[PDB]
Symmetry: C3
Subunit: 257 residues, 3 copies
């Protein structure tokens, strides 16, 4: 399997491609995705990232034949395959630019976990989100247990994770796990629209905001208020802070670096 | 008061019985409920638990006459009564099998707390969920403050806990605190349906999943990703992992131990 | 700018007044608001607090001209302005009485953060809630990043904080961030209604409840169960505990001190 990188304006598009296995994740997808993030990281022609599946599907999870094979191997082989995924996930989560998932058809198992790791999600109204791990005797990975257990109450998180129950794009939207529910086939275009609006915001302010959102889950309010203070003062004194305020006061469009 | 244990297939049914006091909780209910969990824990004929109230009511809370009496006693008497409840709650929360609440009529005070401690809830559409403690000059117990404060935002958690305001089964369902809203009188049957679908899943994978959901509230993502990795590798190498994958690839029904 | 204090029955009303700047927050509003809380704190004629904006607006955030000026000053000037706000916010959050926000028109930037710091919110159906910081090149303050990151899932919290996207009173209500959506111009009256119902509850029990809700975000369940036990026993033995139970058993209205 592979990741294909393209660009439209200031947004990197990463396309998961494994047509025979419905864009299944695997050790080479993890390394190419880490690489594509690393290449774009300090490149100012890129201000946001969209992750999307080639064709009619986002990602159906891992490849069940490869898992069945790693079962003949020592445990460390699978542990190592998971560390690659988990590095991908961490790298998305700490990326200093917004990452957006654009989901057509299925986002299943680690596909769903991947979509949950991004900052935003756009899903076709007929997208199928499911933690399929349970259904084949497994527990989740890609941080799917964390993302759902911490975002949702017990009952529903249990249904999704233990039950392996499908949930709709519309219902995810109503809970706040999906941003925008698009027409079948329009998820990528809608994601590029949303990414364009983010591309117009100040890069340092977005980086700061994402960092705050990350730290909130482990800070008390008091600790967060101190972090917020330091970020705020810094961003105000940054040139973008001056451009942002002056542009609003002048009724013009801010031009950020 | 008492708990009555019965079985239907692979699900234990615990029926709270205190007809004169609308299935009020109390020190003997706590001990019989701990016992019934302990007896079923390593018994493989039981793969899930349903907790339900006898008759038209789930549980209206504690018994107000007993509380009024313990007020004549040293504080330690009530503290000891609470430790029994709190052990019940902990024991549900750490039970390695899914526990499901089936709520007809009222789930009030510690009844509501109890329903929140379970992994799943099924509620009749005319069920009355309420943190009644406030209304009689008290603060909550059974973990109701935790379950609501961590699952809901400030405003609503405050309304429920400070206001003592009733909330509907439908509204709980919309927030993700209730799984299924059933017709009046059908809550138990619906819970047994849901429990049957869980009974078909792999016991070790469900145990692992519940453990992950528990640990998520106190882990960072990084810590959770490591836990997820260890559970995943273990469950893959488990015989159930092989049966689960092989059954799916073969389009047959997995048979788990 | 200023805060105007008035009373109706047992509820203090704090009115944010800065008509030229749409009730913008600033160092003198922070000190007068801290003072008004301190004065009312051990005064039993006050049992709840409503915070509201003078006129058709709640609070549009900070004053952009003052920020633009503090940009000429050393960083410490703005850091000090933020510490005043952050003390206000902390003081609301730890106040032993319920604080309710009554939002007409805009609650923007630190206005939205302020509304999120209160225990309850009542919003006119045409109220505009927005984290505007992003839009002028800034990151948030007043605990807005914490309040949203911990109450909502990633996608939606990102949209609100990074996107600077407006969200409706109705949608906040559906998520549990707003308690009551009122007719335009009725937000304050509805807040006083809700505050009246809180005024009838036992002060010590409400104080305890708010303290529990605060501590839940940093406790495990086990730690919370111990806190709940101690609060419960204390509140039962309190005279209000006896009045609360006796009043309910007697079908009369409890009279609390």
């Amino acid at each position: 399997g592979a990741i294909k990188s393209t660009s439209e304006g200031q947004t990197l598009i990463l396309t998961l491609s494994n047509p025979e296995f419905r864009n299944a994740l695997g050790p080479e997808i993890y390394a190419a995705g880490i690489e594509a993030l690393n290449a774009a990281e300090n490149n100012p022609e890129i201000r946001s990232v969209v992750i999307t599946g080639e064709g009619a599907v986002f990602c159906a999870g891992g490849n069940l034949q490869r898992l069945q094979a790693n079962r003949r191997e020592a445990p460390e082989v699978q542990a190592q395959s998971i560390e690659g995924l988990h590095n991908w996930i961490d790298s998305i989560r700490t990326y200093p630019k917004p990452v957006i998932a654009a989901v057509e058809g299925a986002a299943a198992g680690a596909g769903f976990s991947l979509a949950l790791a991004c900052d935003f999600v756009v899903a076709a109204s007929n997208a199928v989100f499911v933690m399929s791990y349970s259904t084949v005797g497994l527990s989740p990975d890609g941080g799917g247990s964390w993302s759902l257990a911490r975002s949702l109450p017990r009952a529903l998180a249990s249904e999704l994770l233990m039950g392996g129950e499908r949930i709709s794009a519309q219902r995810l939207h109503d809970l706040g796990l999906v941003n925008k529910v698009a027409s079948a086939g329009d998820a990528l275009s809608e994601a590029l629209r949303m990414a364009g609006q983010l591309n117009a915001r100040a890069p340092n302010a977005l980086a700061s905001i994402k960092e705050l959102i990350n730290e909130a889950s482990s800070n008390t309010l008091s600790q967060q208020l101190a972090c917020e203070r330091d970020h705020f003062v810094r961003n105000l004194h940054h040139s973008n802070g001056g451009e942002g305020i002056a542009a609003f006061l002048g009724k013009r469009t801010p031009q950020y670096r």
